[PDB]
């Protein structure tokens, strides 16, 4: 139980219910690497939907019941056997308690039952960490899974700009977006776009500036889709996405005859197509909801290369492709579990 909770010293940066947000930290004094991980957990988009979430998913809306510690697992593990990539890094787990896909900048008030401050929570964690050793960092990897993976896409460049404006131009900010790369496709049987559109207005949600300027007012929901926001980002971003992500299939109302076979095959081809120009990516042909903080994250391979290896090769690439150390790993086989290493 190695990461210790710190509630934000600025108690106006809050979870949905106005309780302070926070972060769990395990320092590694011999390391200049900092991993800041954004938890996932869907979102809520109106009063009634958020009230339901408050009643049975309250830890995603409040710090009142958070434990004093958490164990780092997967990419957050400090054990080299569990985490071949960054086991010696400074580890930060940022709980998701804003229900806004990390996009919000609005406080609870006379007109607002809930605060949606996800974008501000990230900025305040970064600011408070600077006084705890982050000022000496050489790399800050903003990582996250599911809603946190989209959160990386929406926030990595803002963290980079924040550090520049605060006077730390030597810290290299990079992103690792896990399971946050979705398609705004047609459902198999009869929506995120409408829910996200309503969510953005409810949250005062913010998207990266260059993407905002492309899509313009009322169309900021486009920037929640990885394939549309990624080309606009300046920071290096590594994308991890199952070709048959369970959340993608769930929203597509997929739960096998020809029509469904063709639908599933076309989904994997579309996902693969969106990753063609993403040079740092890991996209196995699996049906899964598993994420990079699971202890056995080491086990999956694409073309014989694991994700910890691909991430290490990415680090090397950011020091021409490297002999034997690839960074673009997208399965080409067309059906779930055509890769033998998919999670069981
Ligand atoms: O918590 C989990 N498990 N699986 C998922 C999938 C999406 C999300 S948020 C989200 C929703 C829509 C979009 Cl376009 C981007 C992010 N959260 N999540």
CA–centroid distance, 60 to ligand 1, in Å, is: 14
CA–centroid distance, 179 to ligand 1, in Å, is: 8
What does the block give as tokens for 229?
Answer: 């926001």
Q: Which candidate, 294, 296, 283, places its Cα nearest to that of 327? A: 283
Experimental method: X-ray
Indicate the pairing of strand 237-240 with strand 281-283.
parallel
Distance, CA of 197 to chain centre: 19
Q: Which candidate, 277, 253, 308, places its Cα nearest to that of 85? A: 308
CA–centroid distance, 239 to ligand 1, in Å, is: 15
Whose CA is closest to atom 13 on ligand 1? 224
Relative to the CA of 101, which ligand 1 atom is closest? 9
Which range of residues forms the domain containing residue 101? 1-344
309, 83 in Cβ contact below 8 A?
Answer: no
282, 310 in Cβ contact below 8 A?
Answer: yes
SS3 of residue 15 by DSSP: coil
Active site residues: 146, 245, 289
98, 52 in Cβ contact below 8 A?
Answer: no
Tally of domains within the chain: 1
Secondary-structure breakdown of the chain: helix, strand, coil percentages, each rounded to the nearest 5: 35, 15, 50
Instruction: Calculate Rg over the CA atoms of the chain.
Output: 19
Relative to the CA of 193, which ligand 1 atom is closest? 14
What is the structure's resolution, reported in angstroms to one decimal? 1.3
CA–centroid distance, 69 to ligand 1, in Å, is: 25
DSSP state of 106: B
- Count CB-CB contacts under 10 A for residue 33: 17
What does the block give as tokens for 273?
Answer: 């197509």
25, 68 in Cβ contact below 8 A?
Answer: no
Out of 225, 247, 248, 287, give the residue to mutate to test ligand 1, the one with the largest number of ligand atoms within 8 Å of its CB. Answer: 247
d(CA 99, CA 86): 28
d(CA 200, CA 106): 11
Q: Which residues form ligand 1's pocket by a CB distance below 6 Å? A: 40-43, 101, 146-147, 150, 180, 182, 192, 196, 224-225, 247
Q: Which candidate, 339, 337, 307, places its Cα nearest to that of 239? A: 307
Whose CA is closest to atom 12 on ligand 1? 192
Distance, CA of 57 to chain centre: 19
């Amino acid at each position: 139980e190695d990461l210790r909770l710190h509630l934000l010293l600025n108690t106006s940066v809050t979870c949905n219910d106005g309780s302070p947000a926070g972060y769990y930290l395990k320092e590694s004094r011999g390391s200049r690497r900092w991993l800041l991980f954004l938890e996932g957990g869907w979102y809520c988009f109106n009063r009634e939907n958020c009230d339901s979430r408050y009643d049975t998913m309250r830890r995603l809306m409040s710090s009142r019941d958070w434990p004093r510690t958490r164990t780092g697992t997967g990419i957050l593990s400090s054990q080299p056997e569990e985490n071949p990539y960054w086991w010696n890094a400074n580890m930060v787990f940022i709980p998701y308690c804003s229900s806004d896909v990390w996009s919000g900048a609005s406080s609870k008030s006379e007109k607002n039952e809930y605060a949606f401050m996800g974008a501000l929570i990230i900025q305040e964690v970064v600011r408070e960490l600077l006084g705890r050793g982050l000022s000496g960092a050489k790399v800050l990897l903003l990582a996250g899974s599911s809603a946190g993976g989209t959160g990386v896409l929406l926030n990595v460049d803002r963290v980079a700009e924040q550090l520049e404006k605060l006077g730390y131009p030597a810290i290299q900010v990079r992103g690792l977006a896990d399971s946050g790369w979705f398609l705004d496709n047609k459902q198999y049987r009869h929506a995120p776009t409408e829910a996200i559109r309503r969510g953005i207005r409810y949250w005062n949600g913010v998207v990266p500036e260059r993407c905002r300027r492309q899509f313009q007012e009322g169309e900021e929901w486009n920037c929640f889709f990885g394939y549309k926001v990624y080309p606009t980002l300046r920071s290096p971003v590594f994308v991890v996405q199952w070709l048959f992500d369970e959340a993608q299939l769930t929203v597509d109302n997929v739960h096998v005859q020809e029509g469904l076979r063709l639908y599933i095959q076309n989904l994997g081809r579309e996902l693969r197509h969106t990753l063609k120009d993403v040079p740092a990516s890991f996209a196995p042909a699996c049906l899964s909801h598993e994420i990079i903080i699971r202890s056995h994250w080491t086990d999956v391979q694409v073309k014989g290369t694991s994700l910890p290896r691909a991430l290490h090769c990415w680090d090397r690439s950011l020091h021409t492709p490297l002999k034997g150390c690839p960074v673009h790993l997208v399965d080409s086989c067309p059906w779930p579990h055509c890769n033998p290493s998919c999670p069981t």
